[PDB]
Design a binder for this molecule. Structure first.
Ligand code: UNU
Ligand code: UNU
Length: 340
C-alpha cells in the first residue's frame, strides 16, 4: 500500500485509541432538547428528531430503555455502540454529538441526516444502476477499510442503516452490533438476509462477515432485492450456506465476478479476507472507474440528492405512533450501565 495510505490509517488509529481509552460521558441532558417527531422504532428503543433549545440545531436522538436492553441481553452491545461511536471519525460515519443517561434510558444524540435511509430510495426507484450502486459501494469499502484497521467489525450492513446526506453521500448509522475485536468473535447478531455463513454456523468469525454483507448489499442495490430471501429465517439460512446464488441477466460480468468473490461461502477465500485485504476489492475490474481519493474527499458528483426542504424536514422518514418517553423517579440498572 502507498505510504500515504499507511500514514493516514496510522493517524486514524492513534486518534481513535485516544478517545477509546478515555470516552466522553454525560455531555448533555434531555431538557436541553425539544422533541419533534419519531423517526424510527425498535424492540428496545426509538430514534427521535429533536431540536437543541439554545442553538436551534436539529439532531437525531437514539433512546434506549435500560430495562429492555438488559432483558434482551444487549448490555455489552449498547456499551460497544456508544464507546465506538464517540471514538470514530470518518466522512461516511454519522457523528455522535452528545451522549448521556438518566434513571430510565440511554441517549445518543447524533447529526440528523434529513435525506432518509437508502432503503426507502432503493424501494422507490426499484434498483440502482451499476454506477449508482458502485458510488455507494465505494464508500462502504473505504468505511470498512477504516473500521477494520481500528480492529472494529460493523456487523449490521443493510440499506436501512445507510442514510443519504445533503450531498448524496452515505452516512452509516446504527453501531448497535459494532465491536472492537482482535481475532475472532462469536455473538449471533446482525440481520438474517445479511448474515455470513460462519455466523449462521456458530463459528468464531472475523471482519470477513462485513465483506460478505457488502456482497449482499451490492447485489440488493443492483437487483432491487437481496440474493437470499425467504418467508422463514431458517429458509434464508439454508440458502446462505448452500453456496448458490442466481444473478439477474442485466448484471455485468464484472459485477457477477465481484459478487462471487464477496459471497464466497469459504471465509478463507473471500475477498477482503485474503493476504491483499481490501485491495483485492479496490482493484477489481468492477471498480476500475472509481477514483478512491475523490470519493473520500466527496468530490464526485452524486447520482442523486434527496429532496428535502431543510434541516428539520422529516418527509424522507415515515410515520410512527408518538409514544411517551418516561423517566422513572428511581434509577434502573445503574450498575450495568456505569461506563455509559
Ligand atoms: N421531554 C423532553 O425533554 C424530550 C426531548 C427530546 C426527546 C424526548 C423528550
Ligand atoms: N442520524 C439520523 O438522522 C438517524 C435517523 C433515523 C434513524 C437513525 C439515525
Amino acid at each position: 500500500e502507498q505510504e500515504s495510505v499507511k500514514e493516514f490509517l496510522a493517524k486514524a488509529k492513534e486518534e481513535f485509541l485516544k478517545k477509546w481509552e478515555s470516552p466522553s460521558q454525560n455531555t448533555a441532558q434531555l431538557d436541553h432538547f425539544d422533541r419533534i417527531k419519531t423517526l424510527g422504532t425498535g424492540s428496545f428503543g426509538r430514534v427521535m428528531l429533536v431540536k437543541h433549545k439554545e442553538t436551534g440545531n436539529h439532531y437525531a436522538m437514539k433512546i434506549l430503555d435500560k430495562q429492555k436492553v438488559v432483558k434482551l441481553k444487549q448490555i455489552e452491545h449498547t456499551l460497544n455502540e456508544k464507546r465506538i461511536l464517540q471514538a470514530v471519525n470518518f466522512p461516511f460515519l454519522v457523528k455522535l454529538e452528545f451522549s448521556f443517561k438518566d434513571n430510565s434510558n440511554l441517549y445518543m444524540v447524533m447529526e440528523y441526516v434529513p435525506g432518509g435511509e437508502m432503503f426507502s430510495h432503493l424501494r422507490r426507484i426499484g434498483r440502482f444502476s451499476e454506477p449508482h450502486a458502485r458510488f455507494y459501494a465505494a464508500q462502504i469499502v473505504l468505511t470498512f477499510e477504516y473500521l477494520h484497521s481500528l480492529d472494529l467489525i460493523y456487523r449490521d450492513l443493510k440499506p436501512e442503516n445507510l442514510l443519504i446526506d445533503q450531498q448524496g453521500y452515505i452516512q452509516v448509522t446504527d453501531f448497535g452490533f459494532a465491536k472492537r475485536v482482535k481475532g475472532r468473535t462469536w455473538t449471533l447478531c446482525g440481520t438474517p438476509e445479511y448474515l455470513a455463513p460462519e455466523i449462521i454456523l456458530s463459528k468464531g468469525y472475523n471482519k470477513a462477515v462485513d465483506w460478505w454483507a457488502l456482497g449482499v448489499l451490492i447485489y440488493e442495490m443492483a437487483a432491487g432485492y437481496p440474493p437470499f430471501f425467504a418467508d422463514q429465517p431458517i429458509q434464508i439460512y439454508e440458502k446462505i450456506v448452500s453456496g448458490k446464488v442466481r444473478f439477474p441477466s442485466h448484471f455485468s460480468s464484472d459485477l457477477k465476478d465481484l459478487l462471487r468473490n464477496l459471497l464466497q461461502v469459504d471465509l478463507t477465500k473471500r475477498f477482503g479476507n485474503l493476504k491483499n485485504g481490501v485491495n483485492d476489492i479496490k482493484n477489481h475490474k468492477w471498480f476500475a472507474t472509481t477514483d478512491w481519493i475523490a470519493i473520500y474527499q466527496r468530490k464526485v458528483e452524486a447520482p442523486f440528492i434527496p429532496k428535502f426542504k431543510g434541516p428539520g424536514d422529516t418527509s424522507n422518514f415515515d410515520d410512527y405512533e408518538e409514544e411517551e418517553i418516561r423517566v422513572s423517579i428511581n434509577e434502573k440498572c445503574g450498575k450495568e450501565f456505569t461506563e455509559f
